[PDB]
Design a protein around this ligand. Structure first.
Ligand SMILES: Cc1c(-c2c(-c3ccc(F)o3)sc3ncnc(O[C@H](Cc4ccccc4OCc4ccnn4CC(F)(F)F)C(=O)O)c23)ccc(OCCN2CCN(C)CC2)c1Cl
Ligand SMILES: OC[C@H]1O[C@H](O[C@H]2[C@H](O)[C@@H](O)[C@@H](O)O[C@@H]2CO)[C@H](O)[C@@H](O)[C@@H]1O
Length: 514
């Protein structure tokens, strides 16, 4: 579907997209190739849906956290710049776009949130979150407020949640160990909800409202990234960019992003995109053009980062970055974020308590790994006749009981529905690893095309088991794990909210309990 002889680029609407379009023009000048820059809404959700069908842009810009998902689904070209080009960027930026040992995007700029304050209202900004309520009472007596920032996107609230011990995935990354509902995270989120309760903040505040309030001098502080600074310059607010406040004596820990540019695997213009990015964008003049539209942060390109490093707003961005953590790029980042977005919104609005919101968030963040664990073990033990000896790990009680439940219910389905299982198995002609990939697409669609309950879920998994037995029979045992990942993937993507609403696999256990 993608058109040859041209470049289509997607980038978020808070970045310097007119600036990018000028770098575009310059590429056209030399090559005769038109460059179109677009900034559609929800482009990070839209890219994977459209790229899957071989559609979408040639180039997508986003922070690096999303790109492992994209690579895992096969949606990105492996980029292989030569050593001379690699040496022009900071190795840590290349690290942020490395997935399964392969480079999967070009890094552009490092982004962290800072505290932005209005110096005419607050000559000295607060060192602690704890002093903010009193500061707010003080500012409200003069018709102003202390702080406003986007409470609709968990990226802005995370530095506080993480300050006293909240984490996504532990310290490689242990995907088994999630810290979304530990006491640290509870305390950070509770402090936020109290802010709202006591009228220091409003749960409906979003990007635009916080931006408008700060940029007209109604609120003394916001929380935002470098991209925001241009609009504040335009507004004549006398602002500073500084270190985020501490919570319970500990630094606020923002999740640091590396703005990154990946090339669509379905693109017929890969040499053009590589040439654009390496030799027009990632140059002193290319990045300047973008930075002057909307500041990029600390750019990946060493030569231009040296000029920008002198700016104290960059120094403050790097100081907040140093106290935070580089985002993981693992495929589960998307589910983590979706879960935490929901938890913050619901806690803030009062729809759930902090305990309920973060419990649900934890379940959602663990859902993939846990489902895979159960599903994978079932298919393998069914195929070989023997259980996996290794420990279940964290949430092991749930996993173990789900597996025992599934053994009872799934064996019953296979036994009672042998005929049809044999029938559809026999129809499909599973002989190789290629034919197994085919199978998924069918299961993918047969599952998705129907209602939602545990019987249909058991049925999907049991058929998986039935196929697994076959695959061992014909010495294709290597294909069982990919079958399990595939089944798990349809299950947790299409059924996420229903699964969370059931208390995940504890609900499966209860529903089929004798
Ligand atoms: C495996 C299969 C699926 C199926 C998939 C498939 C096909 C291929 C492929 F890759 O993937 S993925 C998938 N995911 C969820 N469901 C599926 O099926 C059920 C219906 C069902 C079917 C067979 C057994 C039990 C079935 O339900 C039992 C059920 C549902 C609710 N509660 N309980 C009771 C319980 F709680 F106890 F489970 C559903 O959609 O509701 C499926 C769908 C239909 C099937 O046979 C149709 C009959 N042709 C057989 C072949 N012949 C040549 C033509 C006729 C067959 Cl075999
Ligand atoms: O809100 C969760 C969101 O956080 C990050 O998105 C940031 C992005 O990194 C920044 O470049 C800037 O545009 O603001 C976004 C927040 O609205 C993650 O990168 C993203 O994947 C996640 O959903």
């Amino acid at each position: 579907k993608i058109e040859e002889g041209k470049l289509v680029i997607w980038i978020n609407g808070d970045k310097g997209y007119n600036g990018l379009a000028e770098v575009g023009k310059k590429f056209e000048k030399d090559t005769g190739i038109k460059v179109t820059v677009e900034h559609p809404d929800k482009l990070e959700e839209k890219f994977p849906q459209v790229a899957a069908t071989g559609d979408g842009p040639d180039i997508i810009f986003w922070a690096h956290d999303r790109f492992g998902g994209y690579a895992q689904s096969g949606l990105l070209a492996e980029i292989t710049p030569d050593k001379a080009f690699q040496d022009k960027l900071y190795p840590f930026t290349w690290d942020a776009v490395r997935y399964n040992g392969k480079l999967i995007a070009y890094p552009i700029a490092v982004e962290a949130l800072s505290l932005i304050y209005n110096k005419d209202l607050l000559p000295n900004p607060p060192k602690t979150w704890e002093e903010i309520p009193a500061l707010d009472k003080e500012l409200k007596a003069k018709g102003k407020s202390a702080l406003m920032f986007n409470l609709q996107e968990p990226y802005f609230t995370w530095p506080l949640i993480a300050a006293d011990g909240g984490y996504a995935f532990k310290y490689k990354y242990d995907i088994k160990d999630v810290g979304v509902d530990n006491a640290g995270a509870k305390a950070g989120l509770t402090f936020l909800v109290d802010l709202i309760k006591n009228k220091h903040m409003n749960a409906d505040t979003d990007y635009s409202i916080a931006e408008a309030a700060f940029n007209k001098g109604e609120t003394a502080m916001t929380i935002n990234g470098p991209w925001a600074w241009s609009n504040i310059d335009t507004s004549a607010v006398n602002y500073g960019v500084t270190v985020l406040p501490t919570f319970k004596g500990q630094p606020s820990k923002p999740f640091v992003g590396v703005l990154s540019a990946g090339i669509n695997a379905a693109s017929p213009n890969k040499e053009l995109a590589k040439e654009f990015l390496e030799n027009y964008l990632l140059t002193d003049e290319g990045l300047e053009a973008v930075n002057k539209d909307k500041p990029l942060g600390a750019v990946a390109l060493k030569s231009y980062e040296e000029e920008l490093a002198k700016d104290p707003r960059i120094a403050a961005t790097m100081e907040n970055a140093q106290k935070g953590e580089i985002m993981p790029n693992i495929p589960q980042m998307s589910a983590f974020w979706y879960a935490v977005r929901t938890a913050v919104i619901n806690a803030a609005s009062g729809r759930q308590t902090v305990d309920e919101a973060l419990k649900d968030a934890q379940t959602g963040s663990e859902l993939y790994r846990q489902s895979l664990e159960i599903i994978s073990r079932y298919l393998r033990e069914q195929a070989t006749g023997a259980a996996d000896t290794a420990p279940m790990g964290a949430s092991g009680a749930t996993s173990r009981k789900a597996l025992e439940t599934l053994r009872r219910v799934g064996d019953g389905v296979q036994r009672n529905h042998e005929t049809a299982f044999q029938g559809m198995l026999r129809k499909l002609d599973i002989k190789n690893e290629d034919d197994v990939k085919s199978l998924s697409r069918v299961m993918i669609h047969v599952f998705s095309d129907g209602v939602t309950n545990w019987g249909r879920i058991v049925t999907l998994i049991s058929f998986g088991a039935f196929v697994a037995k076959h695959l061992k029979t014909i010495n294709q045992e290597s294909c069982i794990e990919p079958l399990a990942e595939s089944i798990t993937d349809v299950l947790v993507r299409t059924k996420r909210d229903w699964l969370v609403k059931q208390r995940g696999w504890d609900g499966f256990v209860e529903f089929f309990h004798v």
